[PDB]
Design a binder for this molecule. Sequence first.
Ligand code: HEM
Ligand SMILES: CC1(C)[C@@H]2CC[C@@]1(C)C(=O)C2
Ligand SMILES: [K+]
Ligand SMILES: [Xe]
Ligand SMILES: [Xe]
Ligand SMILES: [Xe]
Ligand SMILES: [Xe]
Length: 404
Amino acid sequence: LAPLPPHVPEHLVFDFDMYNPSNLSAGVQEAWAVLQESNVPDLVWTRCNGGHWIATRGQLIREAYEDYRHFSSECPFIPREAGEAYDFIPTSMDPPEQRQFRALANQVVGMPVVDKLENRIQELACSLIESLRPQGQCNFTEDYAEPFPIRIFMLLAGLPEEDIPHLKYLTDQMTRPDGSMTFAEAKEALYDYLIPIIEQRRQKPGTDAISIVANGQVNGRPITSDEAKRMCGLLLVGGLDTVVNFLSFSMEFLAKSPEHRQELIQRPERIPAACEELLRRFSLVADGRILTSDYEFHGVQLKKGDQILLPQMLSGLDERENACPMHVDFSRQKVSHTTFGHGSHLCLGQHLARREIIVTLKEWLTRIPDFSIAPGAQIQHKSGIVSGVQALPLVWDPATTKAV
Ligand code: HEM
Ligand SMILES: CC1(C)[C@@H]2CC[C@@]1(C)C(=O)C2
Ligand SMILES: [K+]
Ligand SMILES: [Xe]
Ligand SMILES: [Xe]
Ligand SMILES: [Xe]
Ligand SMILES: [Xe]
């Protein structure tokens, strides 16, 4: 616990630990949702992880993401030493500077690229699920959730699959550190990996995502090698952690809810709507901003340099945004969330993520329509910048499946 700063009033101190929150055994989303009980203010300070503000309601989260002149992305991670070392592009830049790098990043993960990968995405999903289907069981996080999105990303980036354990280890240290590595060490290891590859693909340009970034232009002038490395590293982290973790929350839910499986089996055209409602309920990202100056925000004096967590996860769990927010309703009329962020840093990979989610749901429910959590298993979650599921043992009767 870190000393309460002079300017923070005692009545706003809620000691939430974003990397190990108290109620984690109830589920990670439920654990973060304690910040939205009736007694907790819209905006609290925690003395954990070096001390920082935490906006607890959607209205505040949205407002702060919109207002980049006060809430800068120059230092977006907690703790402060991670935020300070964080220099990925475009996330560590504010508009106007940030904008030129988004266009280039859209070339490698945008909707036209998803469209092109659509065949290989469908093929991999079907191939992984068919391999599992006759077994009547799997360790879902390791047997599908990791390989499906990771192999697609490695394909797109033109990187060998033998590199996956190394890269996955590093990305995990940046979002859910286990203590062995600081954020800055993990980041420099990722850069060290990328540097020779970026140099090779600048000499010998190809079709892969690293070539496209490394040989690209930003508003009409050549990207530097340094800029290319800082963008490629961001893309790697996005590719190796987000969808991986979200698939496991979604499948855990479906494994526990037969009526929700039945709804999608009966009406598969609802799968896109169900993806969105699962993105609200099992939102999993929480990063933030740093104050560029002293600023009074919703009755609370913030000091220049203060860090504020603006949990993208919380907005759609907010009762004030969505009635009965812990209930999953595929017919929910207005699904309101900030799962893919908000403002000028809106997720660039969201079209790829939705596609992978939708393809997974359709292809899993076609072949393995009925499945359950393995008898006796208690599923454990983990919290951090991106929250996750430690393991997800599933079982089914093969007699109920169908090869397609
Ligand atoms: C379930 C899947 C995903 C979720 C929930 C998610 C969430 C987010 C969020 C909340 C942000 C904004 C962060 C901020 O404002 O500081 C973001 C940005 C970003 N994401 Fe995603 N993401 C997902 C998948 C992906 C994938 C697969 C990629 C592929 C590389 C990706 C690439 C990016 C990039 C490049 C940005 C930065 C945009 C900018 O700073 O201008 N994301 N993501
Ligand atoms: C918070 C994010 C999900 C977003 C894309 C990858 C991630 C970990 C970042 O550093 C920016
Ligand atoms: K920084
Ligand atoms: Xe990518
Ligand atoms: Xe990349
Ligand atoms: Xe899923
Ligand atoms: Xe389905």
